[PDB]
Design a binder for this molecule. Structure first.
Ligand code: 8J3
Lengths: 11, 239
């Protein structure tokens, strides 16, 4: 449940 | 004879550049933020400033050597817990001891204790925050040390929620050995006097600041009226 953070972290 | 290896110099060079890619000492993007007012008058602007800065911190983190080998869950827990710390740390670059204020290029973007309390903080946070900024500024870190400290801060194995503590520890160890070795080979006396241990202590001050920060956030949160005024990255990261 951290889509923004997870999106900023992806390659 | 402690020698700064090729790998350690590469590590340093990466983190310098990673910092240069994510800290704009022009402060140009600040016009994009909701504007500052000088009843929680600063909360919208500072929410935005912090939101922006979380983004930069995330970009810096991604370039830390070995960080991309973590699970994306571990990456997440490490940023959620360190973000506010890394922001207090990076902010040292704009903090000035003249005024004990953070000076980002113009009077609009110059932030003092009245502004911070105008976002809902008491001397509970502000007093140890300023003492932290003062003590860090007085270390006069080389930029090399500043960037290592930020990275060591992010890749801490003891953060709540950490799954693979061994991997986080192995990455941070390579960064601390790089820092320790750099101080030895490149930081002249007397500045270098117990500089490592002084740096680690700043990380303890940041943990305590983090704790206080959680309290005050959780308090500010329980009014939706205020939470409304934040950004969705801030809600996600600090909630
Ligand atoms: C950011 C940075 C800068 C200054 C940092 C400052 C001075 C302004 C006040 C800040 C941002 C301090 C804040 C107010 C401390 C805090 C906090 C809470 O988490 C808070 C309080 C309210 C409501 C939430 C979002 C936002 C405003 C932060 C939670 C900590 C660091 C302080 C400028 C520049 O160097 C970029 C760097 O990246």
């Amino acid at each position: 449940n951290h889509p923004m953070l997870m999106n900023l972290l992806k390659d | 004879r402690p020698k700064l290896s090729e790998e350690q110099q590469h590590i340093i060079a990466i983190l310098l550049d990673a910092h240069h890619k994510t800290y704009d000492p022009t402060y140009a993007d600040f016009r994009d933020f909701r504007p500052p007012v000088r009843p929680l008058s600063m909360l919208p602007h500072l929410a935005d400033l912090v939101s922006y800065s979380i983004q930069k911190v995330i970009g810096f983190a991604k370039m830390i050597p070995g960080f991309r080998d973590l699970t994306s869950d571990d990456q997440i827990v490490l940023l959620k817990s360190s973000a506010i710390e890394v922001i207090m740390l990076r902010s040292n670059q704009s903090f000035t001891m003249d005024d004990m204020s953070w000076d980002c290029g113009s009077q609009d973007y110059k932030y003092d204790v009245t502004d911070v309390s105008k976002a809902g903080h008491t001397l509970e946070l502000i007093e140890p925050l300023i003492k932290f900024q003062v003590g860090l500024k007085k270390l006069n870190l080389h930029e090399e040390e500043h960037v290592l400290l930020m990275a060591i801060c992010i890749v801490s194995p003891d953060r709540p929620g950490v799954q693979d503590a061994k991997l986080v520890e192995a990455i941070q160890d390579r960064l601390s050995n790089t820092l320790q070795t750099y101080i030895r080979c490149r930081h002249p006396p007397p500045g270098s006097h117990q500089l490592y241990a002084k740096m680690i202590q700043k990380l303890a001050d940041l943990r305590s600041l983090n704790e206080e920060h959680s309290k005050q956030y959780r308090s500010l949160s329980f009014q939706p009226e205020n939470s409304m005024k934040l950004t969705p990255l801030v809600l996600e990261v600090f909630g």
